[PDB]
C-alpha cells in the first residue's frame, strides 16, 4: 500500500478486503490469517442463503410468474458469487495489474503536469468510489423499504407468506419472532455484502480506466509544449533535449498501453461473464414488465431490477467509451500543435504518434465485444424491441 | 484516339444503345422506342390500381410494372446525360489503347481475360433476357382464359372480349423487344465498366511492383519520374471510379429501392400460392431479382477489394533500397490506397457483398417468420 | 450582431427571438426587459395549452385508438417545449459557439477564396432558413385546412365533438361562437409558435454545419495552389512564404475542428432527446398507419405526421452526412495535387494532413450515435419492419 | 513429406489420407495406385449410406417432427460429403498452399528466434490436431451410447423401429442378428469416416492459420532488436547491416502475406459452403429445441447437435480472430521500440510498417464475410433470437 496505483486505489482495496473480497496482499502478515477466515465465512453464508433461495425456486416452479421472479432474483444474486469466485482464481493478473505503475517515467520539464494529472486521477477515483457506494446503499435501503410496505400474500385463496426481503425456504419458522428477526438480519447482511463485492470489483475496473484516461490527458497536455521545445536551427544541447522529451513522451505512452492491456485481460473475462448473465436477466425482466398494470409495488420492483442491471452495464460502458475517446483525442492533440516549426525529428515523432493513435484503446469482453456506449445502446435497443414483440404477440 | 465502338469492352453495349439511338445517334428510333413503352407502363400501372382485390393478380402484374418502370427510368436518365456516358466510354477506349501497348506478359493476359469476360457477360445478359422475355410473352397462351403477358387497363375498354384482346397481345409482344433492349444494357454496362476499373487497378499494381526494372539507381530523376507516373495513374483510377460511381449510384439507388419493395411482397406471396405452378413463377421472379442484385454488388465489391489491395501492391515493391523521398511517396500511396474506391448506391450505402449478404439474411428471416406465423 | 458567425446568422437569431426563444444577448439593453417578458408569456401560453391537451388525454383514455392519437399529438408538441426549455439552460455553450469565428486567421494569398466561400455559406444559410420557414408555414396551413374539411364527430351512437384543430379540454362552451373563435385563434398561435421554435433551433444547428462545410471547401480549394507555391530549389523568402502558407492552412483546419466540437457540445444532447421522442412517435404512428383504410382525413393525418417526423430526422442526417463527406473529401483533395514536386516541408505537411483526415468529422447524439444518412436509413428501416410485423400479426 | 509446411503438417496429411481424403501427392508412387481405390470405396460407401438415409426421409415426410430430425441429420452428414468432394476439385490450390514455405528467407541474427517460433508453431499444430481428434472420438462414442440407451419406438400407437444409430431404410430386415449387426458396424464406420473427413480438413485450415500467427510473432520479437541494431553516426558496414535486417523483415512479412492469401482463396470458398449449410442446420435445431421438455435423450441429442455445429463455427472463428489480432499486434509492436534513437532509414521503415499494418490480415468466406469471433457472435445471436421468437409464437 505504498507504491503507485495501490497507494492511489488504497481505499478501494480496503473496501474490497472488508466486504469479504479475499485479496490477502496489502497488509502485514499478522492480518493474513484472521482476514482469511472471515472471507471464507462470508462466502459460506452467501452460498448458504443462495442455496436456500434455489431450493425455494423448486417448489415455486408450478407457476410461471413466480418462476420468472425467482429466476430474476437468482441471477441478480448470481452476479456477486461469480465475481467473488472470479477474483481469487485470477488474483495473479490482478496483482500484476496493480503493480504496473510502481516505477513510471520522469522528465524535469513535464513533472508539474504529471503531478497535477496524477492528483486529478486520484480525486476522480475517490469520487467514483463514493458515488457507487452511495448508489448501493440507496439500493439496499429501497429494497428493505419496499419489502416492508408491500403486502405479503400468495395467489393459489389468500395464503399469508412470510414478510421477507428475499423469497427463501427456511427450516426455521420464519413467521414468529425469533425466526422472522433472524431471517431479516441475515437477508440484510446478504444484500449488503453481495452488492458490495460486485460493485467493489466493478469500481476497481473503472478506477483503472480512470487512471489510464488521466495519463492520456497528461500526455496531450505536455504534447503541446514539447513541439515548442523542439521549434527554435538547433544546437547540440537543444537536440539532446528534444530527444529526451520525445523519449519521455513515447515511453509514457507505451506504459499507458501496457496498463490498458492488463486491465483488458482481467476484466475482459470478467465482463464476458457479467453480460452473459445480464442478457438472460433482461429477457426475463422484459417479460415481467409486460405484466405491469400500474400497481406501485410490482412496477416499483420491475423498474428497480431494470435500473440496477442497466446501471451496471452503463457504468462499464461509460468508462470504456471514455478510454476510447481519450486515445482518439490523443491523435487530435498530436495534430493540433506547432509542428510546422519543429525540427525534422519532432515532425517524424508526430507522424508516428498519429499513426499509432489511428485505432482507439478499448476493453473487450474476451474479444467477443467491446465496452462502449454503443454496446449499451445495443443492449437497450434489444430489450426494448423484445418487449415490443412480447406485447404484440400477447 | 480510338472509338467507342472499336473498344472491345464497351463496343457491344454502345452498339445496342446506338441501334436505339440513345447515346451516339439521334435518329427517330429513340421516340418509337420510348413513347410506346412508357405508355404501356402507364397502362400497366392503371391495371395495377384497378385489379387489387386479389393479391395474386396484384403481385404478378406489379412485378412487370416495376420492371418496365425501371426500364423507362434507366432509358430516360441515359438520354438525359448522353454526353457523360459518351465521354466516359471514350476515356475507357483511350485508356484501353494505352494499356494494350504495355510490353508485359502479365498485363496483356490480364487485359485479354477481363475483356473476354466483359464481352461474354454482356452477350450472355442479352441472350438470357431475350429468352426469359420470350418465355414470359408466350406463357399466357398455355394459360388460356384470355390472359395478357402484362397488365393493361384502358378506361372504358373491354380488352378481353373482342379482337381487341388479339391486337393488345400483339402490341405487347412487339413492345417487349425495345423494353428489354433498354433494361439489360445498363447492367451490362456497369459490369463492363467495373471490369475495366479492375483492369486499370491491376495494371497499376503490376507497375508498382515492377517499376524499378530497367532503371539505374544512381540517377534519381528516372525513379522520381516513374513514381510520379504511378501517382498520376492512381489519380486516374480514382477519377474513373468517381464518375462511374455518380452514374450507377443514382440509377442503382432507384433500382434497389424498387427491388426491395417488390421482394417483400414476393416473399409474402411465396407461402400463399396453392396453384402448384404459380409458385414456380414466384421462385423464378426471386431468382432474377437476386441475380441482378448480386451482379451489381459483386462487381462493386471487386472494385473495392482491388482498390484496397493496391496498398499491398505498393508495399511489396522495391522500396527498401530507394532514397528516402521515394519511400515517403510510397508511404503516401499506401496511405491513400487503404481507403476503398466504393461505388455507393445513392451516395448512402457502398455496394459490397456485405450489403447483399445483409439483404439475403433479412429475406431469409422474413420468410422464416412468415412461414411460422402463417402456420 | 457585429462580428463573425453572428452577423452571418443574424436573421436566424432574430427569427428565434421573435417566436419567444429567449436569446437575450444580441441587441441593445433597452429591448432586454420587454423581450424577456414576452418570452415568458409565450412559454406560459404553450404550457397552458399543453396542459389542456394532457387533461384531454386523461378522460379520452377509455379507448386505445384515441389514446394513441392523443399520445402522438402530445409527443409532436412535446418537441417544441423540450427545445424551448433546453436552450436557456445550455445558453452559455450556445453563446460560446456563436463567438467562435470572431477572430479567424488570414493570409494575403488565400483571402479571395475565403471571401468567396464565406459568401457562399451565407447564401446557403439563408436558402435553408427560407426553405424550412416555408415548410413550417405549409404545415400549419395544411393542419388548419384538414381540420376544417373533416367531420368533427367522435365515436360512441353519434356525438358531435367541437370542431377544433387540436383535441383539447376547455372550460368554455367550445361550441358556440366566442369559445369556438377563441379556441381557433389560440390553437393557430400555438401551432405557429411551436413549429417555429423547434424548427428555428434545428435550422441554427444545420447552419452551423453549413458554415463548417463551406470552410472545409475553402481549405481544399486553397490546398490545390499551396503546393504550387511550395514547388519551385527554394530561397529563404520562398521558404518563409511556404511556411506561412502551411501555418495558415493548419491553423484554419484546427479552427474548423474547434467549431465542429463546439457545435457537438452545444447541440449534442438535443439530438438525443429528439430521437428519444421520435422513436416513440414513430412506433405509435406505425400502429396508426396499420389502421388506414383509404379514408382521406385519416390517411392524410397519418401521412403528415410521418412526413414531419422523418423530415426533422432527415434534416439533421443530411447535414451531418455532409460534414462527414466534406472531411473525407479533404483527405482526397490533399492527395490529388502536385505534392511530389513540393519541398520536403510541404510534403511532410501533406503527409500529416492526410493522416489526420483518415477519420471524418461528425456530430454525435451524446455519443449514442452519429447524425448521418445511415442513421436516417436505419430509422426508416426500423419503422418499416415494425409496420410489417404489426400488419402480419394482425 | 520433406519440405517446409508439409514436413510440419505431415501428421495431419497422413490422417487426411488415411480416412480416404484423396491427397495423392506425398508418398512414393508405389502407394499411388492402391490408395486411390481405397478413397473411391470410402466415397461410394458414404454416398450409399447417405442415399439410404435420404430415401428414408421420403417416407418419413408425412409428419413434420421426424421430417425436421431427418433434415438435421442429412445436413450434418452433408458437411463431410461436401468437404470430401471439394478437396479434389481444388487440390491444385491446396498443394500450391502447402508448397509456399519451401524456401524461406534467412538472416544470421534472427535465426534463433526463427527456429524457436517454428518449433512453437509445430507444437501448437500437433496440439490442435490431437484435441480435435479427441473431440471427434468423443462425439462418435456419445452418438453410439445415446443410440443404445434410448428407446427405439415410433408413434403411429407404439411401433418397434430398428435400433440403429442413424435412422435409415435398408433392404434387409435390420432387426434380426445379421442385418442388425451389419447395419451397426456400417453406421459406426460411416460416422467415424464422415466426422474424420470434415474435421481433418478444418484442422488443416486452422494449422495454416497457426503457422501464420507464429510467423507474425517471430516478426515482432525480432522487430524489437532490429531498431537497437540501427541505433548507434553509423559506419558503412553498420548501415549495410541495418539495411540487410530491414530487408529480411520486409521479405518475411510479405511471405506471411502470400501464405495468408493462398489459405484465403482455398478455404474461403470452403467456409462459404460450410456456413451456408450451418445456417439451415441451426434454424432447424432451434425449432427442435423449442420442443424440449426435460427428457434426457431428446435434450441430449439436440444439445449435441447444437454443440457440434457451434464448435465447428467457433474453431474457424477462433483462428481467424487470432490472425487479425496478430497482424494488429504487429502494428503495435512496430510502434513500441526505440525508434526515436534510430537513423532515418530505420525510422522510415517503422513508418511504412505501421502504415501497412493499419488493415489487419483476415480470411473471408469468399468475400461474403470474415472469419472472426464477431461472425460466431452474430451466428449465436441469430439462433438465440430465432429461438426466442419461436417460443413466444408457440
Author numbering:
A (entry chain B), C (entry chain A), D (entry chain C): 4 to 159, 168 to 243, 313 to 474
B (entry chain D): 1 to 375
What do the authors say?
Most insects, including human-targeting mosquitoes, detect odors through odorant-activated ion channel complexes consisting of a divergent odorant-binding subunit (OR) and a conserved co-receptor subunit (Orco). As a basis for understanding how odorants activate these heteromeric receptors, we report here cryo-EM structures of two different heteromeric odorant receptor complexes containing ORs from disease-vector mosquitos Aedes aegypti or Anopheles gambiae. We determined the structure of a heteromeric complex formed by ORs from these species in complex with a Apocrypta bakeri fig wasp Orco that is amenable to structural determination. We find that these complexes form asymmetric tetramers containing 1 OR and 3 Orco subunits, where activation of the sole OR subunit upon ligand binding suffices to open the ion conduction pathway.
We first focused on the conserved OR10 receptor family, which detects indole and derivatives in various mosquito species. The cryo-EM structure of an OR/Orco complex has a 1:3 subunit stoichiometry. Aside from the different extracellular loops, the OR10 and Orco subunits have very similar fold, despite having only 15.1% sequence identity. Importantly, the residues in Orco that are in direct contact with AaOR10 in our structure exhibit 97% sequence identity and 100% sequence similarity to those in Ae. aegypti Orco, providing a structural explanation to the ability of Orcos to substitute for each other. The cryo-EM dataset of the unbound AaOR10/Orco complex contained two distinct subsets of particles. The existence of active and inactive states in the unbound dataset suggests that even in the absence of odorant, AaOR10/Orco is an equilibrium mixture, consistent with the well-characterized high baseline activity of insect odorant receptors in the absence of odorant ligands. The strength and shape of this unmodeled density suggest that it represents a lipid molecule co-purified with the heteromeric complex. The long tail of this density, in turn, is wedged into the groove between the S3-S6 and extends into the transmembrane space, helping stabilize the inactive conformation by preventing helix S6 from moving towards helix S3. Thus, both the presumptive lipid and the phenyl ring of Phe136 appear to stabilize the inactive conformation of AaOR10/Orco complex by holding S6 in place.
